[PDB]
Write an enzyme that holds these catalytic residues in place. Structure first.
Site, mmCIF file in Angstrom:
data_model
loop_
_atom_site.group_PDB
_atom_site.id
_atom_site.type_symbol
_atom_site.label_atom_id
_atom_site.label_comp_id
_atom_site.label_asym_id
_atom_site.label_seq_id
_atom_site.Cartn_x
_atom_site.Cartn_y
_atom_site.Cartn_z
ATOM 1 N N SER A 1 1.162 -1.111 0.264
ATOM 2 C CA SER A 1 0.005 -0.121 0.025
ATOM 3 C C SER A 1 1.001 1.118 0.449
ATOM 4 O O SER A 1 1.994 1.573 -1.041
ATOM 5 C CB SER A 1 -1.423 -0.047 1.256
ATOM 6 O OG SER A 1 -2.084 0.719 0.916
ATOM 7 N N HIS B 1 -7.145 -5.600 -2.338
ATOM 8 C CA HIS B 1 -5.960 -5.061 -2.119
ATOM 9 C C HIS B 1 -5.585 -5.392 -0.439
ATOM 10 O O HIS B 1 -4.260 -5.409 0.184
ATOM 11 C CB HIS B 1 -6.311 -3.920 -1.137
ATOM 12 C CG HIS B 1 -5.618 -2.885 -0.812
ATOM 13 N ND1 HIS B 1 -4.258 -2.573 -1.534
ATOM 14 C CD2 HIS B 1 -5.746 -1.972 0.340
ATOM 15 C CE1 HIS B 1 -3.701 -1.735 -0.894
ATOM 16 N NE2 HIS B 1 -4.133 -1.413 0.195
ATOM 17 N N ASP C 1 -7.956 -4.951 -6.912
ATOM 18 C CA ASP C 1 -7.860 -3.838 -5.973
ATOM 19 C C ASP C 1 -7.629 -2.264 -6.631
ATOM 20 O O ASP C 1 -6.846 -2.264 -7.820
ATOM 21 C CB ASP C 1 -5.813 -4.497 -5.519
ATOM 22 C CG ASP C 1 -5.065 -3.979 -4.884
ATOM 23 O OD1 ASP C 1 -6.247 -2.499 -3.907
ATOM 24 O OD2 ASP C 1 -4.054 -3.626 -4.339
#
Length: 269
Positions: free
Chosen positions: A146, A258, A201
């Site tokens: 991330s 994600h 994602d």
């Protein structure tokens, strides 16, 4: 679609990335062992892996993570944590760019990501460098999930060319700069960026291409579903800057996707 050795590196740095979300791993005594609640990082635990440095809410964008020593695999691992609340972070993320001629000419980078790395860059370089002179046969590896995978990539582009190679493994990372930056990241020597994405994602789809952002090549895309164990036939290598065919497809993106990169990631307390 990738080799087993590549799958195992991919698998191993996902768990390093995962381990940065456990709060024990952000302010721990050097020489101590890197562990995770919830079985988030069994591969790290199987190696004799200890803290070199440990950091929490550092500099400008609350940089959090750890510098690790891995004697079993012979690695120096800089791992950056993503946001402590991803959903809130996806929704508040600005798309503001800034010039980064420091790194490469004609290149622009996300103001937030760029600034945050700049904040902690000197110290953390000192810390990596000390590990290198001390373990000169060890391989330097920057990794994250991330917002951490963005920090890894930017720090990787910044520190390379100083005598040691730096591989970068990023998991569900957002785009990080404009086209000249993505181009730069595609050809830069002194280490390999392994940019890993899962099905649809959302995070690698931001900031939008309409705001002047591009993705470097290649792209390692995981086609197996959320909560589904990954094998090596489920990772397809997608080439070409801004390529379509992996994560960058015109379809409705997802948040749970994600949080599943080889197993749960970003949920360690």
């Amino acid at each position: 679609e990738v080799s087993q050795d590549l799958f195992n590196q991919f698998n191993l740095f996902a768990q390093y990335s995962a381990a940065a979300y456990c709060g024990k791993n952000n302010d721990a005594p050097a020489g101590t062992n890197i562990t995770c609640t919830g079985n988030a990082c069994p591969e790290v635990e199987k190696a004799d892996a200890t803290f070199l440095y440990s950091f929490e809410d550092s500099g400008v964008g609350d940089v959090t993570g750890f510098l690790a020593l891995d004697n079993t695999n012979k690695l120096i691992v800089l791992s950056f944590r993503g946001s402590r609340s991803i959903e809130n972070w996806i929704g508040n993320l600005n798309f503001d760019l800034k010039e980064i001629n420091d790194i490469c000419s004609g290149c622009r980078g996300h103001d937030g990501f760029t600034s945050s790395w700049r904040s902690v860059a000197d110290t953390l370089r000192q810390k990596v460098e000390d590990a290198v002179r001390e373990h000169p046969d060890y391989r330097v590896v920057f990794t994250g999930h991330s917002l951490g995978g963005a920090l890894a990539t930017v720090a990787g582009a910044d520190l390379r060319g100083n005598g040691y190679d730096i591989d970068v493994f990023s998991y569900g990372a957002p785009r990080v700069g404009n086209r000249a930056f993505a181009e730069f990241l595609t050809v830069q020597t002194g280490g390999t960026l392994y940019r890993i994405t899962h099905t649809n994602d959302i995070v690698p789809r931001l900031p939008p291409r309409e705001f002047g952002y591009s993705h470097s090549s290649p792209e390692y895309w995981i086609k197996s579903g959320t909560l589904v164990p990954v094998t090596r036939n489920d990772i397809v290598k997608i080439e070409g800057i801004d390529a379509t065919g992996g994560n960058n497809q015109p379809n409705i993106p997802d948040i749970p996707a994600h949080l599943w990169y080889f197993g749960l990631i970003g949920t360690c307390l």
